[PDB]
Amino acid sequence: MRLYSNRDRPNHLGPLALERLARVDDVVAQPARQPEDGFAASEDSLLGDVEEYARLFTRFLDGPVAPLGDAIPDDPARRAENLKASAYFLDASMVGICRLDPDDRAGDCDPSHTHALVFAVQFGREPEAGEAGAEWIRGTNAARTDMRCAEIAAILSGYVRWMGFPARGHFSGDAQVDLARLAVRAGLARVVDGVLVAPFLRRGFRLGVVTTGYALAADRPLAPEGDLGETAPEVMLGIDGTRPGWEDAEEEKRPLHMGRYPMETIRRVDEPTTLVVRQEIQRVAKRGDFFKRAEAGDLGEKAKQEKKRFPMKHPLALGMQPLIQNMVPLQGTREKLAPTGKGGDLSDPGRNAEAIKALGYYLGADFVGICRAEPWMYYASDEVEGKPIEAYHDYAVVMLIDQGYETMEGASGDDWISASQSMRAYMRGAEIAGVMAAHCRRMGYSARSHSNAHSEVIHNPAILMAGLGEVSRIGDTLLNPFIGPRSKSIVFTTDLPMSVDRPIDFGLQDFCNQCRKCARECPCNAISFGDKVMFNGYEIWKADVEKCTKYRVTQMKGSACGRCMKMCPWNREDTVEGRRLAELSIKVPEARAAIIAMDDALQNGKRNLIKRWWFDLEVIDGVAGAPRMGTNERDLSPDRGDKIGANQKLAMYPPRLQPPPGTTLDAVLPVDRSGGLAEYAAAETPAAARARLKSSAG
Numbered sequence: 001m002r003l004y005s006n007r008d009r010p011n012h013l014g015p016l017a018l019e020r021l022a023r024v025d026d027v028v029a030q031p032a033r034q035p036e037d038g039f040a041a042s043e044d045s046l047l048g049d050v051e052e053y054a055r056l057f058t059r060f061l062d063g064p065v066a067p068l069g070d071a072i073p074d075d076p077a078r079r080a081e082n083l084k085a086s087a088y089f090l091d092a093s094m095v096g097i098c099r100l101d102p103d104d105r106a107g108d109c110d111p112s113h114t115h116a117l118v119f120a121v122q123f124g125r126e127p128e129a130g131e132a133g134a135e136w137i138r139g140t141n142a143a144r145t146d147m148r149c150a151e152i153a154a155i156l157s158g159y160v161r162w163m164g165f166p167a168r169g170h171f172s173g174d175a176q177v178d179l180a181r182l183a184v185r186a187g188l189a190r191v192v193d194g195v196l197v198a199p200f201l202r203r204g205f206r207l208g209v210v211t212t213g214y215a216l217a218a219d220r221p222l223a224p225e226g227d228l229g230e231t232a233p234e235v236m237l238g239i240d241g242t243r244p245g246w247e248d249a250e251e252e253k254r255p256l257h258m259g260r261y262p263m264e265t266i267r268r269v270d271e272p273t274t275l276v277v278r279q280e281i282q283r284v285a286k287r288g289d290f291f292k293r294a295e296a297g298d299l300g301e302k303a304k305q306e307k308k309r310f311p312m313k314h315p316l317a318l319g320m321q322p323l324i325q326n327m328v329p330l331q332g333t334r335e336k337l338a339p340t341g342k343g344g345d346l347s348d349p350g351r352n353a354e355a356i357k358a359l360g361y362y363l364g365a366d367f368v369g370i371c372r373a374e375p376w377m378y379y380a381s382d383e384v385e386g387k388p389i390e391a392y393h394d395y396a397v398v399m400l401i402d403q404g405y406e407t408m409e410g411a412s413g414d415d416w417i418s419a420s421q422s423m424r425a426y427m428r429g430a431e432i433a434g435v436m437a438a439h440c441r442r443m444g445y446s447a448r449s450h451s452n453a454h455s456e457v458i459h460n461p462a463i464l465m466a467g468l469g470e471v472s473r474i475g476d477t478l479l480n481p482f483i484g485p486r487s488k489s490i491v492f493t494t495d496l497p498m499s500v501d502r503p504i505d506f507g508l509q510d511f512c513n514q515c516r517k518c519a520r521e522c523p524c525n526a527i528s529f530g531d532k533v534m535f536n537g538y539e540i541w542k543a544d545v546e547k548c549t550k551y552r553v554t555q556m557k558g559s560a561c562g563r564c565m566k567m568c569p570w571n572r573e574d575t576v577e578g579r580r581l582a583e584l585s586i587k588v589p590e591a592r593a594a595i596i597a598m599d600d601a602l603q604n605g606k607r608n609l610i611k612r613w614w615f616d617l618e619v620i621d622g623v624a625g626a627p628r629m630g631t632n633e634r635d636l637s638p639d640r641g642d643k644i645g646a647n648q649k650l651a652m653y654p655p656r657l658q659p660p661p662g663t664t665l666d667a668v669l670p671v672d673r674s675g676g677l678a679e680y681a682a683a684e685t686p687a688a689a690r691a692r693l694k695s696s697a698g
């Protein structure tokens with residue numbers, strides 16, 4: 001939570017006030033090492049698990065280089081900006097660039113590399129002694145942070161390669177250059193008693209590097225002696241939109257298992273705020289996921305042909321792809337395992353829940369919750385062989401990763417960066433859950449993660465039962481009171497016993513009932529302007545998933561879409577002013593209509609041009625080029641009818657209109673749009689459902 005907005009600050013400058021520190025042109029080099037853990041790891045810890053994912057990311061530090069197209073901007077200052085903004089987008093804490101000199105190119109480094117992108121990732125917060133999970137995490141920060149450096153270095157390496165320039169990533173596990181030296185030269189750190197010290201990162205950090213012949217404007221080293229200006233009043237208050245100087249210390253007062261956002265102040269309820277009738281919920285084949293439908297031909301030729309490609313049109317997304325795909329085989333086991341003895345005392349489920357949450361926040365989740373994995377949350381059958389899926393684990397641990405407010409401010413929602421937002425949050429989530437599930441397995445509890453590339457559960461109902469969101473108008477997206485609908489979830493299921501969270505009520509039903517903004521702004525009118533309906537046993541505002549799927553897969557003026565998330569009033573900057581509007585919305589019902597109307601009069605959702613840090617590049621046949629058909633640049637739309645609720649006819653595809661369990665990708669089942677439209681018109685009202693259920697319980 002900042003005090004001042006960053007709405008006028010370009011993304012390449014990052015969340016810290018690096019531009020206010022004292023700098024000089026050059027410094028004298030000297031021996032230096034990276035920060036290490038204070039304490040050593042206890043015997044059984046997370047160490048083995050973060051090391052496995054670090055080895056995996058090591059494989060993608062190099063790779064093939066695409067041919068050079070003609071759309072890469074020449075100016076090294078503009079390349080520098082974009083690459084620093086890319087690194088902040090992946091959650092580097094600090095970024096700089098320096099020139100590579102002959103002492104660096106003389107080792108195993110490719111001799112055509114002239115430049116280095118240098119980035120730091122801050123150590124995560126550790127639990128205190130005696131807190132749940134302390135022994136899992138204590139002493140693993142170098143390795144946990146290295147794994148994240150490797151991930152970032154691989155993704156960015158891969159981006160530059162796909163732009164057509166050779167590039168290689170480096171980190172402590174695998175480096176051909178002196179990392180520490182470069183961090184000094186690029187102006188991230190200074191040396192104290194042979195150890196790097198970085199302004200603002202008081203917990204310690206580790207480094208990643210990308211070397212490349214892609215020429216870039218270089219930064220200047222920090223002044224080597226004395227105070228740099230990190231406590232000047234402008235910096236302490238963060239007037240330009242940066243982190244206040246006391247934010248770290250205020251956050252450290254909260255125990256790590258509570259997260260950064262105060263989810264403890266939200267009202268909990270036993271039953272969710274919308275009707276869920278478990279006995280009437282049928283399980284759905286994986287083959288009914290509408291992307292799988294698209295893949296198999298159910299939605300027509302165009303959609304079939306675009307399905308592999310639609311989210312991989314931008315080079316940055318293609319940098320992520322190999323990590324995403326190769327995490328899949330590590331997702332874990334469905335079989336029961338024997339407890340192992342490792343992991344300290346596991347007999348208290350309340351403490352286990354705290355430990356798992358802490359672990360999630362240590363690895364970088366924004367929200368962690370836990371619910372029972374009910375059988376109706378698992379798909380009925382897989383889509384490749386058509387075999388039944390068993391409800392094999394008892395618990396679902398559900399994490400939210402924020403898609404990134406600032407990037408989205410700059411975007412249309414359906415332009416060239418949309419899919420990269422999705423993919424970054426899927427990638428990061430899969431990494432976190434992979435590690436966490438792996439840790440459960442090392443303790444002898446079966447655990448398996450469920451990513452965008454391979455999932456056997458439907459995230460939504462778990463997000464709901466874990467109390468991380470309420471049902472919203474957008475439809476197939478649940479909304480959180482602090483980051484709104486701006487998230488991707490990741491889930492791992494496991495048998496580790498844990499107390500469960502409970503659903504939340506923060507007044508969203510009433511708020512969404514007076515708002516239509518997401519619906520108004522959807523490019524294909526997929527989002528309902530009317531009332532909630534019953535759908536496969538539960539109450540929901542059902543969007544038209546056919547129309548949405550066709551637009552996201554097929555539209556040629558960007559890479560997919562998430563405009564609905566962008567335009568929602570609950571999607572807000574992490575500032576005091578933002579948080580206060582969220583609190584008003586929750587605590588003061590009379591204010592909601594006013595907030596809804598003012599969100600428009602203030603032009604929230606307008607594209608903010610300062611935040612547009614990315615290049616409009618479309619990869620066609622292995623080469624990046626300017627967008628063939630152009631680029632979506634949408635603005636706010638005017639109001640629709642008072643009568644649009646009554647006139648819009650959407651289709652819905654509950655189980656009866658889906659491919660049945662057992663169907664694979666080899667079969668085709670053309671979508672029955674007629675039937676889906678008539679099914680929507682026949683859907684039961686929630687009110688009638690409530691009364692029908694009451695009439696049985698007499």
Ligand code: B12
Pocket residue numbers: 276284288289290291418422452455457458459460461463464469471474475476477478479485487488489490526527536538539540543544545546548549552561562563564565653654655
């Ligand atoms: C396929 C898919 C889509 C497709 C097709 C949807 C469909 N229904 O087939 C389309 C393209 C429409 C789509 C769009 C988007 N999606 Co999508 N999608 C998925 C995916 C991969 C599978 C859904 C599914 O398996 N099939 C659909 C069958 C099962 O659906 P159904 O019978 O219609 O049921 C749906 C809902 O009713 C709900 N649901 C099921 N049972 C229950 C029970 C209860 C009680 C409740 C309340 C809800 C609920 O889950 C289904 C979601 O599609 C999930 C990931 C996952 N494994 O769940 C992400 C997922 C739902 N998508 C998500 C998002 C964010 C998007 C987009 C915003 C795109 C983006 N840029 O990120 C848009 C939002 C569109 C909208 N209006 O909501 C997020 C939602 C997270 C959240 N905060 O709740 C998910 C969970 C991915 C993730 N891991 O974060 N998506």
Ligand code: SF4
Pocket residue numbers: 414521522523524525526527543547548549551552561562563564565
């Ligand atoms: S519902 Fe689909 S198409 Fe509509 S705005 Fe959301 S993501 Fe885009």
Ligand code: SF4
Pocket residue numbers: 472473474479511512513515516517518519567568569570
């Ligand atoms: S835009 Fe309005 S209606 Fe749509 S989800 Fe957000 S609050 Fe609800």
Ligand SMILES: [Cl-]
Pocket residue numbers: none
């Ligand atoms: Cl999606």
Ligand code: NA
Pocket residue numbers: 566567568569570571572604605
């Ligand atoms: Na908004």
